Amino acid sequence: AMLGGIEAGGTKFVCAVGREDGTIIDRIEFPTKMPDETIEKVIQYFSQFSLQAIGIGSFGPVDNDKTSQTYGTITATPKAGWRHYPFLQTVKNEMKIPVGFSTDVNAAALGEFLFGEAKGLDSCLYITIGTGIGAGAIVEGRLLQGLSHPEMGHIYIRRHPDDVYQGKCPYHGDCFEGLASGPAIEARWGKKAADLSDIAQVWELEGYYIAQALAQYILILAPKKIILGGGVMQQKQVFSYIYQYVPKIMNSYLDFSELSDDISDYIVPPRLGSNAGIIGTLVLAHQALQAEAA
Amino acid sequence: AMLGGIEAGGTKFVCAVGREDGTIIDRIEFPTKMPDETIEKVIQYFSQFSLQAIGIGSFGPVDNDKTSQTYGTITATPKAGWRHYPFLQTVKNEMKIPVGFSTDVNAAALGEFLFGEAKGLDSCLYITIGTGIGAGAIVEGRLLQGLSHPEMGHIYIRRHPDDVYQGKCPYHGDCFEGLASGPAIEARWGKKAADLSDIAQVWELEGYYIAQALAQYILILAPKKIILGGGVMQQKQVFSYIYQYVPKIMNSYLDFSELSDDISDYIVPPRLGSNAGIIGTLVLAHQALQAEAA
Ligand SMILES: Nc1ncnc2c1ncn2[C@@H]1O[C@H](COP(=O)(O)OP(=O)(O)O)[C@@H](O)[C@H]1O
Ligand SMILES: Nc1ncnc2c1ncn2[C@@H]1O[C@H](COP(=O)(O)OP(=O)(O)O)[C@@H](O)[C@H]1O
Ligand SMILES: [Zn+2]
Ligand SMILES: [Zn+2]
């Protein structure tokens, strides 16, 4: 079976064709514009191929409750045209094959869970740190989907007492995303994050904030592997700060090697690199195919 | 089938006999002392009855990984004799019937999930606020058990800027438990919490801290019902503060009635009152019985 994947982002769309084992056969990308024109490009790209199912990993928040009238829509976004657009249903109507749906970060979690750092485990957490901060979690082999999908980027961690930055988040100001996203780093220090790579205090601070968030996730969810991706995490030096800070914050409370001596194999970059998300959309496609047949 | 339950606490043990539908037939309690003598009382109480299975809901942290060599032990505690005592195995050796094991707060979650405020849902979160703070979560109808059971009481929420109290927690100082447990309230204000019922600012502050914790849990786990029990939550006025503060902290980020207009039916006291835990131990017993037969 050939499967289609759509990783829908605020800035670009990535579409791919691939197989259930996560092999990417072909891909394309294009800028995100209004939904009708953007989706028409998707349909035109897939028109070349004979696909059995598609999966969509979308920027959110989204309505990921399959029982909901608004399932398969983006529920909050400043991007023009996208909130409440019938994203999933338009792709189902055009393509006439099964279509899976999830957040983009859920897709990345599935990619690492099946083919990456969590292969063989029954739990993991994938976090991206880029334009925003978001996370997807697998619990007992299934994506975590409660009242909502998680919005773990918006938790309120403690400000560093020397950090004077007010925060980037339009909703909360200095939530984790507001303090530690790519744009927050840029707004705080006055240059883009990639151009601050030689300024240690930038990454100390970023590592401190990420470590505070991870301690909360460890105490609440206790995932068996934590995978950190996104633009900001291309600054690999951040990991060393995280590994120093997490044990200080937890202060020996939970006696596991993952959280102390072997933390460097617990909190890791994605095995699939920057492709975890798009590969995960193929998993969503395969799931949707199997569910239709059942 | 008659089932036995053991709710093991730091101060007292509660033992009960009951049925799979959560009916309590009989109960006894006694102070927690050293483990051999305490467990001998358990065995002597159950000796009267013909039981098919037992469930243990223990104060933790515990090792709740069934594949672990140290499964069914308490892994951290200042109480003399308890850390690493073979609690589960001693009860299995003496009783010679199936024995279930979990944290005490996991038991309370099961009680409310089957017989209480979450009956009919597939997700919930039970939090106790007493001598410590702890929580158990049900996800897709099963207790959440990752690398560890959750230790949600120890997350680091933001101090109120006018609160000068250093915090009660021996590990973290001013983690949620350190700021908002019963003993923290007493140490901060100089009287026991029950004797401060007429001092509004005590409960404003407590509501503010609990609300901050709940916002984090909502963003990370997104449970479909939040149940708040424990000694401190006998001060029912705390709920009204929580209902005012949660929406301010979230600032309309997640559009669900549970988090706004209908928050008073989302964050609730236990339907089972102070018996959620002991009833939950009967559910652990029934589970252990069924698992043996399978
Ligand atoms: N190599 C890098 N090092 C540090 N920051 C980066 C790097 N690449 C991108 N960024 C920053 O990360 C953010 C973009 O995140 P990214 O994961 O690339 O995309 P998006 O989150 O929009 O899908 C921007 O703030 C950008 O400046
Ligand atoms: N009715 C009450 N109102 C406020 N605080 C209470 C009340 N009862 C007990 N407390 C406080 O809660 C803590 C005890 O918690 P509780 O849930 O009764 O027991 P435990 O956590 O030890 O099982 C103590 O700090 C106690 O002073
Ligand atoms: Zn935010
Ligand atoms: Zn603590």
User: Which domain CATH number covers B168?
Assistant: 3.30.420.40
Helix (H, G, I), strand (E, B) or coil at B4: strand
- The answer, for A152 touching chain B at a CB cutoff of 8 Å, is yes
How are the residues of chain B apportioned to helix, strand and coil, as percentages rounded to the nearest 5? 40, 20, 40
Q: Residue for token digits 């994506």?
A: A143
Residues B221 and B108 in one domain: yes
Cis peptide before B61, with omega less than 30 degrees from 0? yes
Residues A133 and A48 in one domain: no
Q: How far apart are CA A58 and CA A69, in angstroms?
A: 18
Q: Which of B70, B103, B136 is the last residue of a domain?
A: B103
Residues A7 and A61 in one domain: yes
Residue span of the structural domain in which B94 resides: 1-103
Residues A120 and A51 in one domain: no
To one decimal, the resolution in angstroms is 1.7
Is residue A47 exposed (0-12), middle (13-18) or buried (19+ Cβ within 10 Å)?
A: exposed
Residues A126 and A86 in one domain: no
Q: How many CB atoms lie within 10 A of CB A216?
A: 26
Cis peptide before B98, with omega less than 30 degrees from 0? no
Residues B99 and B109 in one domain: no
In A, minimum Cα distance to B153 occurs at A219
* Alpha carbon distances (Å) from B290 to B107, B133, B293: 17, 31, 5
Residues A144 and A190 in one domain: yes
Q: Which of B55, B87, B103 is the last residue of a domain?
A: B103
* Alpha carbon distances (Å) from B75 to A179, A225, B72, B156, B201: 35, 21, 9, 22, 37
Residues B57 and B120 in one domain: no
Token representation of residue B138 = 């049900």
* Paired residues of B228 in beta bridges: B127
Stretch (H or E) spanning A227: strand A226-229
Q: Which of A103, A120, A155 is the last residue of a domain?
A: A103
CB contacts of B149 in chain A (<8 Å) are 222
Cα–Cα–Cα angle for A97, A99, A104, rounded to 5 degrees:
155
Q: Residue for token digits 């609730």?
A: B268
Cα–Cα–Cα angle for A26, A32, A34, rounded to 5 degrees:
130
Alpha-helix runs per DSSP H in B96-175:
104-115
Closest CA to A59 of A89, A40, A85: A85
- The answer, for A115 touching chain B at a CB cutoff of 8 Å, is no
Alpha-helix runs per DSSP H in chain A:
35-46, 87-95, 104-115, 176-180, 182-189, 200-220, 237-250, 276-293
Experimental technique for the deposited model: X-ray
Instruction: Give me the torsion for CA of A155, A160, A163, A164, rounded to 10°.
Output: 70
Token representation of residue A153 = 């980027």
Which residues, at least 6 apart from B7, have a Cβ–Cβ distance to it below 8 Å?
B13, B14, B15, B16, B57, B104, B107, B277, B278, B281
Residue B104 one-letter amino acid: D
Strands of the A267-268 sheet, one edge to the other: A142-143, A133-139, A124-129, A226-229, A267-268
Residues A49 and A97 in one domain: yes
Q: How far apart are CA A1 and CA A288, in angstroms?
A: 13
Token representation of residue A199 = 């300024």
- The answer, for B147 touching chain A at a CB cutoff of 8 Å, is yes
Residues A113 and A186 in one domain: yes
Token representation of residue B144 = 């959440």
Q: How far apart are CA A101 and CA A6, in angstroms?
A: 9
DSSP string, A233-264: GGSTHHHHHHHHHHHHHHTT-S--GGGTTTGG
Cβ-defined contact of A220 to B220 (cutoff 8 Å): yes
Does any ligand 1 atom lie closer than 6 A to the CB of residue A58?
no
* Alpha carbon distances (Å) from B231 to B6, B67, B194, B273, B274: 19, 34, 9, 11, 9
Residues B137 and B190 in one domain: yes
With the most atoms of ligand 1 within 8 angstroms of its CB, the residue from A232, A235, A239, A275 to mutate is A232
Cβ-defined contact of A156 to B152 (cutoff 8 Å): no
Q: Which protein residues are within 6 Å of ligand 2, measured from CB?
A: B 9, 11, 128, 130-131, 182-183, 186, 192-194, 230-232, 234-235
Residues B65 and B182 in one domain: no
- The answer, for B61 touching chain A at a CB cutoff of 8 Å, is yes
Total count of domains within chain A: 2
Residue B81 Ramachandran class (φ > 0 left, ψ -120 to 50 alpha, else beta)? left
Q: Report whether B22 contacts B13 (CB < 8 A).
A: no
